[model samples]
Target: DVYTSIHIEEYESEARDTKLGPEEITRDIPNVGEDALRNLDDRGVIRIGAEVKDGDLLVGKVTPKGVTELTAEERLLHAIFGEKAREVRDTSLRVPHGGGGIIHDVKVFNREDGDELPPGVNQLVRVYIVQKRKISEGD
Candidate 1:
């Protein structure tokens, strides 16, 4: 078999069950920043100009850990005031195996930007990557 240059445009979004709204809690977890839920860039885990391999994080997303993930004081707090967003669990996007590339561009879209949003989707992001191959005997 022969090979040629490959181009990729991938659409990615954080998956959520909506058990708790993004605004329910505002914890600054690793990767996610700012408002913790509303802002697109805040949840973005990877940025352009970075090389990603299989299993690389694309976005940083957090959901309620529920009562199962309470630790010490957190458990105490939860018992008294109910569960907090915690932003502990990770449901972020990752690059699949087979082929990974250097991130060329990262695009983030939000409802306030007038971008069309699919059901249960308030934010959307796309990653663009391109690479040139010589197409030798095998690649």
Candidate 2:
């Protein structure tokens, strides 16, 4: 089976009751496996003839300059408030699955929020890679 679709789901921290909760956002990616999915060079372009499969470690996407970078006012606030002025920022990447099949869904659970998860769980951001295969009618 060929991988025809790709999607990214992000859950952000929200305020619930008295503690932080989670909210989700998603984006659909087009044309998977047709070309390289990520940029390897500093110029921010996907390399030609570069192929990727499951379990490959693609480079992390750079946050938009205005989003992560500190502005003049933000710098002043950080200097005055120290750690209190800082906000949480999440960084993530989606790469091809090495198995070369279709991905159904990827659910990343937050382990630090009293979630008892299996080993190899990312402390900050948990990632889930789900896949599916197409079956022929003859089978």
Candidate 3:
């Protein structure tokens, strides 16, 4: 089974004009910067330059497609790291339940696997966690 979710974050660039383009000094380009060239230097499009170096916090939910499930740590890592591999540290997870015996609307929530588990266990629930991460040179 495959699972996916959204990554929410407030990203700050180390340099303001990294993508500043003379032609885009006043407009916005989808996911690009001001007056930026479309796919200039293939910054975010490919792995040809250092433009891909940045730290991002991942936040998302985990859903079970059929029988497979995603762990809380896995979801958070996937959200923050995407396909680029990185190392994680100081990780922590929290599962907060609501007053009505329901879970809160959290960034991490799990779907059911449709398979049976041991008694006293309900459907796999999702959780959100965080960590201090560093991207390696190979990443």
Candidate 4:
């Protein structure tokens, strides 16, 4: 069978290994793979890509600007929009897939109470590549 492939990339702020409470830990929305996609909610659906399949590494600090460079506007936006805008606006590098070159969908999950995420925290990134299978008449 032949398949049509697509590439996906994701990033997140707030270190995963850091010790923080539930609120702090939930501040950033983690990237979801195909397997995890099924369990997400409506907001989660919009926040995450449709399908997963395969993915790249969890990149951190993938922004065009570093932590210190983040402006008040950027922080506000991130607090409100979560990681979606930042990923698309900054990172989310596109690479060649089965038949396509460089493509990614951005998603953001906001924390409750609209609290801003920690500074100096490198956002995580995940890339997913998907392809559609083809069938022949003989099959």
Candidate 5:
């Protein structure tokens, strides 16, 4: 039930080819397990000071041991129901960049017991980044 949302923003600078400015983006993900959520940050999926490029794997979930250990027939049932399968969400650019970019920022929020992130949500993780493109003189 957990999910990831990626936000990418592009900007132009007057002083240089490009510059990453201060901006904010937010999202809320729900139904995530405690340990799994922590693993996202601890495992470098949501790391600060990390550079992310197009098609980068930002967050993912692996199949649980019990599910992976199941027999073929049993696993087939779970697959049919869309359960116990590995899931991952990656980041991509809406348009091609001129050249350079950096992850500049990251933010995350965890929901507490009895806490509601939204009408039906209970957990959240927010990530924001600026991808600056360097425009060369020639095309």
Candidate 6:
């Protein structure tokens, strides 16, 4: 059989940055907020050209965790109505498959980038993945 090559271009988010909890529910029923997760320079957790066949890493994501531990006088603050604890959770994005791609490019869009987003979405990001596959008769 003669060999032919086929290619696929895929787009993943710059990374979902952070997950607060139940923000976006796909296929229906929910809402989310804008937390501009990815950095304009770094493009979320991963950079422009990175590999993960060896399980390097994907665009980064983070989430928030409510504080559980307390200090003496810190706990005493409940008498005065204590405040929130600010810790982050690692909500990283992991991609799985049989093949690997060399992250061709990483792109981010914002109101400043001359891009128009949905009503509440102020910014957007898209990362491109280029892949190669062997072609068969119908493919």
Per-residue lDDT over 19-133 for candidate 3, one digit per residue giving the tens place of the 0 to 100 score = 2121111111233333223223332211121121111111111211221233567556776777633222211122232211211222211224455544333223232222223
In order, candidate lDDTs are 0.56, 0.38, 0.26, 0.37, 0.39, 0.46
Q: Write one digit per residue (lDDT tens) for candidate 5, span 39-138.
A: 3464435455555543333443221123344567766777687775432222211223332345465544444444345532323444456654444687
User: Roughly what TM-score does model 6 have, to 2 decimal places?
Assistant: 0.47
TM-scores of all models? 0.58, 0.22, 0.16, 0.23, 0.38, 0.47
- Return the lDDT, model 1, position 95: 57
**Residues forming the 10-long window of minimal summed lDDT in candidate 1:** 32-41
**Candidate 6: how many backbone clashes?**
2
Q: Report the number of the highest-TM-score candidate.
A: 1
What is the alpha-carbon lDDT of model 2 when measured against the actual structure?
0.38
Model 1 stretches with alpha carbons more than 4 Å out: 1-3, 15-17, 24-43, 68-87, 97-99, 135-139
Can you write out model 6's per-residue Cα lDDT over 1-139, one digit (the tens) per residue?
Answer: 7665646556544323233443431211012212222221343345565553433334444444444533566566766766743445444344565336666676766566687666534345666677755456884
lDDT of 4 by residue, 74-128 (tens): 7678668776343212232322323222224543434454646556443333444
Candidate 5 regions exceeding 4 Å error are: 1-44, 61-100, 113-115, 137-139
**Backbone clash total, candidate 2:** 4
Model 6's lDDT to the true fold? 0.46
Once fitted onto the true fold, the runs of candidate 6 whose alpha carbons sit more than 4 angstroms away are 1-3, 14-45, 54-57, 67-86, 97-99, 119-122, 133-139
- Which wins on lDDT, candidate 3 or candidate 4? 4
Which residue pairs come into collision in candidate 3?
A: 24-35, 110-126
Candidate 4 lDDT score relative to the true structure: 0.37
Which candidate order results from sorting by TM-score in descending order?
Answer: 1, 6, 5, 4, 2, 3
